[PDB]
Amino acid sequence: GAMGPPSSRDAVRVTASAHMKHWLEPVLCEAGLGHNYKVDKVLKVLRIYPRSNTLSSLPLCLCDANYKILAFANYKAIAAFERKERRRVTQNLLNSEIMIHSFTIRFYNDDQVQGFFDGLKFKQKASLFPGYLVLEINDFSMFNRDQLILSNAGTIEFLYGTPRYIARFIEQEFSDEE
Numbered sequence: 001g002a003m004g005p006p007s008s009r010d011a012v013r014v015t016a017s018a019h020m021k022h023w024l025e026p027v028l029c030e031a032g033l034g035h036n037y038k039v040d041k042v043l044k045v046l047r048i049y050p051r052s053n054t055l056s057s058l059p060l061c062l063c064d065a066n067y068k069i070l071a072f073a074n075y076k077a078i079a080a081f082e083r084k085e086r087r088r089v090t091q092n093l094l095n096s097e098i099m100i101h102s103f104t105i106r107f108y109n110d111d112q113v114q115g116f117f118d119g120l121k122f123k124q125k126a127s128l129f130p131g132y133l134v135l136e137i138n139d140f141s142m143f144n145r146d147q148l149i150l151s152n153a154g155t156i157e158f159l160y161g162t163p164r165y166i167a168r169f170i171e172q173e174f175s176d177e178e
Helices: 024-031 075-085 089-096 110-116 163-169
Strands: 045-048 060-063 068-073 098-102 105-108 132-137 139-142
Touching: 024 163, 045 089, 060 089, 068 110, 075 089, 075 139, 089 098, 089 139, 098 132, 105 110, 110 132
Parallel strands: 068 132
Antiparallel strands: 045 060, 060 068, 098 139, 105 132
8 A cells, every 4th residue: 555656757856066166265366356346156154143133144254265254244135135035044044155246355353353243352463454354245145055064164274364365455555654
């Protein structure tokens, strides 16, 4: 007395082929992104601190392929996931993979990151100017449906000591010259 028909004609086929790639290196050199730039890449988030706003999107910590930076999504980007998925993205949607359509570079200091997170303290080794690279998510979308975590984030280094990041954004101008 067998029961339950086979799943073939009624069911569909799923492949899903996507792997993490290093864009932090080429983006700052090959792409030379700066003030106004827009590229498509994958990003993984490891920590999120929900707020009373109940927008399902707030300042969170993410780790890329080469380094881990701090970033926050704009309301325009926040409302997007709500319309397309009508669910909390910060839960498991962000952890999987995200494709940012547009993003802008921003500098953050010890005080800025403090308020940005529950109380994460970043050491810049005695610095007056901001040495933290923070991105902005104006509009993003779910790239990979599958849920995966960046287990290689531990081996990844920090941008706080990267001479390239500091030289490209800080060494550009320091003295007022006036």
